[PDB]
C-alpha cells in the first residue's frame, strides 16, 4: 500500500491466470498491479545507486598564489633567473621590460625579467567515472494484504513483515527473488540498460552539488587540473589559466589571479542532468527500468476465511485520490477475525448488485482480538454511486461522486 | 654576512621634514618596507613597496627608494612620532628577510626637566638581618640620560652600586631607580652617604646619617 | 578580523626545551606564509625563518638555519617555534607575522612572546618599609621589593584605593640573577596619624602575597 497517494501511478492491469505482466518503473513513479485470484501488488523504484567511483579527474576554481618574486637582469648581460624556477608548483613568465639608465644598467634596450608565484589551488571540483557494472538498482514491494490504517507507509522493522520486501537488482545478476512469506514468492526478472545513458558520461561534483557531464565539454575546460587521485601536495597541470600576469614595470610583474568560477560553471551546467550522492554512492534519476515479473508462486492470503459479522466504522473520512479511486479506513468491533471484509459498490443500494471493481482485492482483518483497523481502496464507477461496508444490518453507506 | 646600515639617532624639530635613510646592496633590485615601532607595542606598517601608504596610517608618512639608498620623508614631524623606526627587505635572492639596524627619532620640543630625586636608608628590620640597601629614586627628568654615583663618607663608592636604564613614564619625562647593597657593618662603618645624579650639567645630591 | 594569538610569557633555564605556538584565527591559513622575528631586549628585529603551511616549506636565515626548529599543524592553524637546547642568549621578544602575498612581505604581527632563560630559581621576595625623616609639608612613603625572581610584582597601595602619586619604578636584573624593585607614594605629612598606609606586594610564579605597613 505504499503508493496511495502517488502522483504519477500507472493502473497496471493484469491478465486472468496468466502468470506475464509487463511493468516500468520511473523514478517517483509507482505501479499498482492487480490480476485473477491473486492479491494486488505495489511495485515501486525508489532507488538507482552507483557502485565506487574512481575519480578521473579534478580541475581548480579557486587558487591562492603565494611566495611571488621578479628577478631581472641587465640588457646584453644575461639571461635573468631565480632561486625557486624549476619548481613545479611555481609558475612563472619570462618577459622583456625596458631598462635604461634610470633603472640602474648602462645601456639603453630591453632587458629579461622573470618572475614566479607558488600555486596552491583552494578549492577545486573532481570529476569520476561511472559503469554499467557500477550501478545498482533498489525494488520495493508492498501488497495491499489488508493493513491496518495509513501510516503503513514505514520501512521501520519491515524484515518482520510479510506483503512488504526490498529486492537489490545488479547488471550482472538481475533475478532478484522476492519473498512475502504470507502470500509465497515472486519471481522478477528485470533489465537494465533501458537507463538511458551511461555511454561516455562523467560524474562530475564541485562543493556538494554534483552532475553528469559529458566528455569532451569536461575535457575542454581552461582550468588547471590533474589527473592524479593524490592528496600529497600534487602538481597542477595549466596553471595559466587562472594566473595573469600585467604591467611589470623594472622589478615586480604585477600578478592578478582571475578570482573563484564556481558560479562560472554554473552558468555552464544550466540545462545538465543533475545527480546526487549516497555518502559513498551515487544517485541517478533517469530510470525508466523496464521490467517482467511472473507471479506465479503468488497465493492470495484470506480465502478460507468466512465473510465478518459484526458492524464496522468508518475511522477516518473517504478521499478520492487524483487518478479516481477512494480510499477507505474502516474498524471493526469483534472477535470473529480473521474474516473478509464484506466491502462492495452498488448504486441500487436495495439488494444489492455490485457496480465498480475493487482495487484491495479480497480486503481481510489481519488480527483477531478486539477492535482492529484496516485500510481499503476502490474503484468507483463514473458517476454517483454508493459505498457500502459491512453485512446485513449495522452496515454503512455512503454517498460518492467521481470527476 | 649581509646587514641593512641604519643611522642610529636622528633628530627633528617639531613641524619639519625628518628624513631617514636606510642604505642597501639589492634594493635597486627589490623593495623595502618602512616599519614604526613604539616601546612595548608591536611594528606597524609605514611604507610598502617603498611608495605606497596603507590605510589609516596620515598623509604626511611619505617614502621613496632611489638607487642603492631607500627613504623615508616625514613632513611636518610631530612628538607623538617620537619612536623607533626599521626597514625591512629581501636579499639578493627574494626569498629570505632582512631587517636594518634601527634609527631611534628625537623631537626636541619638550622643554628640559630637573631629576626628581628621592633617597632612602636601609629599613629598620634589614639591619637586624645584618644587612642594608640605599634605595635613590629619579622621576621627572627629561632627557633620558643620567649618571649616578654614590658618596661614603664623602668617598666614592667603586662596588655594591646597581644601575637601571632610563624607563619612561607617561609624563613624558624619564624615570629610573638605582639600589645600593651593603651590610649593617659597612653601613654602620661610616657617616654620610650621598646619592649623586648627573642629569645635563645639574648635579642633586641627597644624603642620609644613621641617625 | 585577522586574529593572531602568540602564546604567554615563558621563562625556562638554560638547556630546556622550549615550544612557542601563534594560534591563527580570521584568515585562509593554508594560503598565507607565516614568519618569525626575534627582538632581543634593547636590540632591533631579526627575521628567523618562513613556512608555509601548504606544505610546511620552510626557509631559514643562515644566522639561525640549524639552531631552531619551525612547525605547523594546518589542521588547527596555528604555527610554531621551538628550541631543543635553550641558550641563555635566547631570552627574547618573538613576534609571529603572517606574510603578504610578495615573498616575505610582512602583513600582519602579532603581540610578541617574552621568553625568558636564565641560570637562576623561583624565589620569594623580601618586603622592608621605607619612611623618611622627621620641609614638615609633604612627604614619601616607599616599599621595598628585594631580591626576588622571576618578573612580573604587582605591588599597590591600601588594595587600590590611592590614585594619586603611585610610582611604581621598573625591576633592575642584579648580577645574582634576581629582580628588585620599589614602589612609592606621595602622601602629605598633615595626614599621617588619619590614614594608615600599607602596601599590598604580589608576586603569582611564588605564590606571594605580602602587604607590609609603613611609618
Ligand atoms: C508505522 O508506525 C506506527 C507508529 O506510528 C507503528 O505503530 C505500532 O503500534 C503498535 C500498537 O500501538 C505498537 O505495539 C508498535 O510498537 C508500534 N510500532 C512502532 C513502529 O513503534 C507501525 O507498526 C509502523 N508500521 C506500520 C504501521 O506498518
Given at each position: 500500500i505504499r503508493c496511495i497517494?502517488?502522483?504519477?501511478?500507472?493502473?497496471?492491469?493484469?491478465?486472468?491466470?496468466?502468470?506475464?505482466?509487463?511493468?516500468?518503473?520511473?523514478?517517483?513513479?509507482?505501479?499498482?498491479?492487480?490480476?485473477?485470484?491473486?492479491?494486488?501488488?505495489?511495485?515501486?523504484?525508489?532507488?538507482?545507486?552507483?557502485?565506487?567511483?574512481?575519480?578521473?579527474?579534478?580541475?581548480?576554481?579557486?587558487?591562492?598564489?603565494?611566495?611571488?618574486?621578479?628577478?631581472?637582469?641587465?640588457?646584453?648581460?644575461?639571461?635573468?633567473?631565480?632561486?625557486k624556477q624549476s619548481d613545479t608548483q611555481y609558475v612563472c613568465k619570462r618577459t622583456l621590460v625596458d631598462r635604461g639608465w634610470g633603472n640602474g644598467c648602462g645601456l639603453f634596450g630591453k632587458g629579461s625579467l622573470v618572475t614566479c608565484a607558488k600555486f596552491a589551488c583552494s578549492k577545486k571540483m573532481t570529476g569520476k567515472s561511472i559503469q554499467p557494472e557500477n550501478l545498482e538498482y533498489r525494488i520495493m514491494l508492498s501488497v495491499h494484504g489488508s493493513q491496518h490504517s495509513g501510516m503503513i507507509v514505514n520501512d521501520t522493522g519491515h524484515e518482520t513483515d510479510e506483503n512488504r520486501a526490498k529486492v537489490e537488482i545488479t547488471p550482472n545478476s538481475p533475478r532478484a527473488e522476492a519473498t512475502l512469506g504470507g502470500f509465497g514468492s515472486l519471481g522478477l526478472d528485470c533489465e537494465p540498460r533501458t537507463g538511458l545513458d551511461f555511454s561516455d558520461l562523467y560524474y562530475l561534483t564541485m562543493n556538494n552539488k554534483h552532475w553528469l557531464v559529458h566528455k569532451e565539454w569536461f575535457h575542454d575546460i581552461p582550468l588547471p587540473w590533474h589527473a592524479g587521485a593524490d592528496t600529497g601536495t600534487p602538481h597542477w597541470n595549466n596553471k595559466e589559466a587562472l594566473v595573469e600576469f600585467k604591467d611589470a614595470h623594472a622589478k615586480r610583474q604585477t600578478v592578478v589571479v582571475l578570482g573563484s568560477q564556481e558560479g562560472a560553471v554554473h552558468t555552464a551546467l544550466a540545462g545538465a542532468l543533475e545527480a546526487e550522492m549516497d555518502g559513498a554512492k551515487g544517485?541517478?534519476?533517469?530510470?525508466?527500468?523496464?521490467?517482467?515479473?511472473?507471479?506465479?508462486?503468488?497465493?492470495?492470503?484470506?480465502?478460507?476465511?468466512?465473510?465478518?459479522?459484526?458492524?464496522?466504522?468508518?475511522?477516518?473520512?473517504?478521499?478520492?485520490?487524483?487518478?479516481?479511486?477512494?480510499?477507505?479506513?474502516?474498524?471493526?468491533?469483534?472477535?470473529?477475525?480473521?474474516?473478509?471484509?464484506?466491502?462492495?459498490?452498488?448504486?441500487?443500494?436495495?439488494?444489492?448488485?455490485?457496480?465498480?471493481?475493487?482495487?484491495?482485492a479480497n480486503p481481510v482483518i489481519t488480527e483477531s482480538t478486539e477492535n482492529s483497523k484496516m485500510m481499503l481502496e476502490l474503484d468507483p464507477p463514473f458517476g454517483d454511486s454508493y459505498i457500502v461496508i459491512g453485512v446485513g444490518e449495522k452496515k454503512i453507506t455512503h454517498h460518492w461522486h467521481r470527476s | 654576512?649581509?646587514?641593512?646600515?641604519?643611522?642610529?639617532?636622528?633628530?627633528?624639530?617639531?613641524?619639519?621634514?625628518?628624513?631617514?635613510?636606510?642604505?642597501?646592496?639589492?634594493?635597486?633590485?627589490?623593495?623595502?618596507?618602512?616599519?614604526?615601532?613604539?616601546?612595548?607595542?608591536?611594528?606597524?606598517?609605514?611604507?610598502?613597496?617603498?611608495?605606497?601608504?596603507?590605510?589609516?596610517?596620515?598623509?604626511?608618512?611619505?617614502?621613496?627608494?632611489?638607487?642603492?639608498?631607500?627613504?623615508?620623508?616625514?613632513?611636518?614631524?610631530?612628538?607623538?612620532?617620537?619612536?623607533?623606526?626599521?626597514?625591512?627587505?629581501?636579499?639578493?635572492?627574494?626569498?629570505?628577510?632582512?631587517?636594518?639596524?634601527?634609527?631611534?627619532?628625537?623631537?626636541?620640543?619638550?622643554?628640559?626637566?630637573?631629576?626628581?630625586?628621592?633617597?632612602?636608608?636601609?629599613?629598620?628590620?634589614?639591619?637586624?638581618?645584618?644587612?642594608?640597601?640605599?634605595?635613590?629614586?629619579?622621576?621627572?627628568?627629561?632627557?633620558?640620560?643620567?649618571?649616578?654615583?654614590?658618596?661614603?663618607?664623602?668617598?666614592?663608592?667603586?662596588?655594591?652600586?646597581?644601575?637601571?636604564?632610563?624607563?619612561?613614564?607617561?609624563?613624558?619625562?624619564?624615570?629610573?631607580?638605582?639600589?645600593?647593597?651593603?651590610?649593617?657593618?659597612?653601613?654602620?662603618?661610616?657617616?654620610?652617604?650621598?646619592?649623586?645624579?648627573?642629569?645635563?650639567?645639574?648635579?642633586?645630591e641627597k644624603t642620609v646619617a644613621p641617625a | 578580523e585577522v586574529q593572531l594569538v602568540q602564546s604567554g610569557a615563558e621563562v625556562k633555564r638554560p638547556g630546556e626545551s622550549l615550544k612557542i605556538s601563534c594560534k591563527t584565527s580570521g584568515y585562509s591559513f593554508t594560503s598565507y606564509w607565516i614568519s618569525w622575528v626575534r627582538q632581543m631586549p634593547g636590540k632591533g628585529l631579526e627575521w628567523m625563518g618562513a613556512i608555509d603551511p601548504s606544505d610546511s616549506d620552510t626557509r631559514y636565515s643562515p644566522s639561525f638555519q640549524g639552531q631552531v626548529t619551525i612547525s605547523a599543524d594546518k589542521s588547527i592553524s596555528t604555527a610554531y617555534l621551538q628550541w631543543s637546547s635553550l641558550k641563555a642568549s635566547d631570552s627574547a621578544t618573538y613576534y609571529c607575522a603572517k606574510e603578504g602575498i610578495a615573498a616575505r612581505s610582512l602583513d600582519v604581527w602579532g603581540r610578541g612572546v617574552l621568553v625568558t632563560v636564565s641560570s637562576a630559581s623561583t624565589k620569594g621576595p623580601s618586603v622592608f618599609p621605607l619612611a623618611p625623616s622627621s620641609s614638615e609639608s609633604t612627604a614619601a612613603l616607599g616599599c621595598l621589593v628585594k631580591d626576588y625572581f622571576p618578573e612580573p610584582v604587582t605591588v599597590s597601595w591600601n588594595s587600590g584605593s590611592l590614585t594619586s602619586g603611585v610610582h611604581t619604578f621598573p625591576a633592575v636584573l642584579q648580577s645574582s640573577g634576581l629582580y628588585s624593585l620599589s614602589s612609592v607614594v606621595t602622601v602629605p605629612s598633615s595626614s599621617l596619624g588619619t590614614q594608615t598606609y600599607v602596601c599590598n606586594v604580589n608576586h603569582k610564579p611564588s605564590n606571594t602575597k605580602v602587604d607590609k605597613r609603613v611609618e
Open positions: 497517494g502517488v502522483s504519477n501511478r500507472d493502473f497496471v492491469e493484469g491478465m486472468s491466470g496468466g502468470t506475464w505482466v509487463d511493468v516500468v518503473l520511473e523514478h517517483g513513479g509507482c505501479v499498482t498491479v492487480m490480476a485473477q485470484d491473486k492479491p494486488t501488488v505495489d511495485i515501486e523504484l525508489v532507488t538507482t545507486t552507483v557502485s565506487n567511483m574512481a575519480e578521473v579527474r579534478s580541475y581548480c576554481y579557486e587558487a591562492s598564489i603565494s611566495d611571488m618574486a621578479s628577478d631581472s637582469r641587465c640588457p646584453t648581460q644575461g639571461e635573468a633567473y631565480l632561486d544517485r541517478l534519476s533517469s530510470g525508466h527500468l523496464k521490467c517482467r515479473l511472473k507471479m506465479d508462486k503468488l497465493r492470495l492470503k484470506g480465502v478460507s476465511y468466512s465473510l465478518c459479522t459484526a458492524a464496522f466504522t468508518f475511522t477516518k473520512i473517504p478521499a478520492e485520490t487524483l487518478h479516481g479511486t477512494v480510499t477507505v479506513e474502516v474498524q471493526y468491533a469483534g472477535t470473529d477475525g480473521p474474516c473478509k471484509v464484506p466491502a462492495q459498490m452498488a448504486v441500487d443500494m436495495q439488494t444489492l448488485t455490485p457496480v465498480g471493481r475493487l482495487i484491495t | 654576512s649581509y646587514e641593512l646600515t641604519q643611522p642610529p639617532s636622528v633628530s627633528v624639530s617639531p613641524g619639519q621634514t625628518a628624513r631617514i635613510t636606510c642604505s642597501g646592496d639589492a634594493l635597486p633590485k627589490k623593495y623595502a618596507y618602512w616599519f614604526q615601532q613604539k616601546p612595548g607595542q608591536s611594528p606597524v606598517l609605514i611604507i610598502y613597496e617603498d611608495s605606497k601608504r596603507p590605510s589609516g596610517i596620515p598623509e604626511r608618512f611619505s617614502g621613496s627608494s632611489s638607487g642603492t639608498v631607500a627613504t623615508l620623508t616625514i613632513s611636518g614631524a610631530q612628538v607623538e612620532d617620537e619612536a623607533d623606526y626599521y626597514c625591512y627587505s629581501t636579499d639578493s635572492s627574494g626569498y629570505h628577510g632582512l631587517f636594518g639596524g634601527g634609527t631611534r627619532l628625537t623631537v626636541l620640543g619638550q622643554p628640559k626637566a630637573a631629576p626628581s630625586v628621592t633617597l632612602f636608608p636601609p629599613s629598620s628590620e634589614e639591619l637586624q638581618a645584618n644587612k642594608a640597601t640605599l634605595v635613590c629614586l629619579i622621576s621627572d627628568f627629561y632627557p633620558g640620560a643620567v649618571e649616578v654615583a654614590w658618596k661614603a663618607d664623602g668617598s666614592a663608592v667603586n662596588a655594591g652600586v646597581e644601575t637601571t636604564k632610563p624607563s619612561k613614564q607617561s609624563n613624558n619625562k624619564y624615570a629610573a631607580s638605582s639600589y645600593l647593597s651593603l651590610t649593617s657593618d659597612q653601613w654602620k662603618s661610616h657617616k654620610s652617604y650621598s646619592c649623586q645624579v648627573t642629569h645635563e650639567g645639574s648635579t642633586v | -
